[PDB]
Design a protein around this ligand. Structure first.
Ligand SMILES: OC[C@H]1O[C@H](O[C@H]2[C@H](O)[C@@H](O)[C@H](OCCCCCCC3CCCCC3)O[C@@H]2CO)[C@H](O)[C@@H](O)[C@@H]1O
Ligand SMILES: *C(=O)/C=C/N[C@@H](C(=O)O)[C@](C)(Cn1ccnn1)[SH](=O)=O
Length: 265
């Protein structure tokens, strides 16, 4: 594989779309690679990680409990609720809802949680409170993936997202237990995690949340590193490409391969 920046360029050339990327040391925030890092990209399902960071902040403040059971109705379900559709009779705890939203990208679970933090506006205000003045959530779970060109709704930038994830995971804004919980949910991703491990060389750590939307929108926020350590945060978004999902996946994997082959920078 070529150097990371050269692979990123090749990916835009092959997809006819924009790639947004940031590679950052998780412990210190050192930015290693930055491409279109201040440009807007649809967050798609990656917003679910920030969502649960806001929920954990409420738990830390004593305004929420991960144990609290939420009972909902069938009428509350939206498109793609693999976990939540199974608990109409018994409900789900807030913690279970975050596990379902992050590890299975359960949309009804995300919407139920979103309501607890004040909706899209409430989540955006939480982002503003931790110092992210760019990322914005404007719509609910199954409408935020539209990705209209020029539409600023439901977008983030690679730099903003990376900084925000680092803040949630390591800045002590969240309690030690909450930081550990957010990390574990990402480690537990069932949608892309196992697949990524199957193609990663032995010794590489992976935790992640992926997403996809219209007009080729694709995204992944992840922790990656050799020696089984979450050494760096890597955020990659793709937008406005007519490419098949398989090729968008292949290009992202290619950027990952370039990082792996040229790690010491
Ligand atoms: O020299 C380094 C490595 O080179 C190859 O590994 C390949 C691997 O066989 C391939 O499957 C993967 O594809 C990349 C898979 C990445 C999947 C997604 C990664 C995510 C993680 C974070 C966000 C962006 C992408 O590339 C590596 C590096 O070339 C060799 O097979 C391996 O033995 C060797 O240790
Ligand atoms: C978040 O990015 C969600 C994207 N796609 C979801 C969805 O829109 O609800 C589906 C269900 C694909 N999917 C399943 C699990 N993760 N993504 S839709 O694109 O089929």
């Amino acid at each position: 594989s070529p150097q990371p920046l050269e692979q990123i360029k090749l990916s835009e050339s092959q997809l006819s779309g924009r790639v947004g990327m940031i590679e950052m040391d998780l412990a210190s925030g050192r930015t290693l690679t930055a491409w279109r890092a201040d440009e807007r990209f649809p967050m798609v399902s990656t917003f679910k990680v920030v969502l649960c960071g806001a929920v954990l902040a409420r738990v830390d403040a004593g305004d929420e409990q991960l144990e609290r059971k939420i009972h909902y109705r069938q009428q509350d379900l939206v498109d793609y609720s693999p976990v939540s559709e199974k608990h109409l009779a018994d409900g789900m705890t807030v913690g279970e809802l975050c596990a379902a939203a992050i590890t299975m990208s359960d949309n009804s679970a995300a919407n139920l949680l979103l309501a607890t933090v004040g909706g899209p506006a409430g989540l955006t205000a939480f982002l503003r409170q931790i110092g992210d003045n760019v990322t914005r959530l404007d719509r609910w779970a199954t409408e935020l993936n539209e990705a209209l060109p020029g539409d600023a709704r439901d977008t983030t930038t690679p730099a903003s997202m990376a900084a925000t994830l680092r803040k949630l995971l390591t800045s002590q804004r969240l309690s030690a237990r909450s930081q550990r919980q957010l990390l574990q949910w990402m480690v537990d991703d069932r949608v892309a995690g196992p697949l990524i491990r199957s193609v990663l060389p032995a010794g590489w750590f992976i935790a992640d949340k992926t997403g996809a939307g219209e007009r080729g929108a694709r995204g992944i926020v992840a922790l990656l590193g050799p020696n089984n350590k979450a050494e760096r945060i890597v955020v990659i978004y793709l937008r406005d490409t007519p490419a098949s999902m398989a090729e968008r996946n292949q290009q992202i994997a290619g950027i990952g391969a370039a990082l792996i082959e040229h790690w010491q920078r």
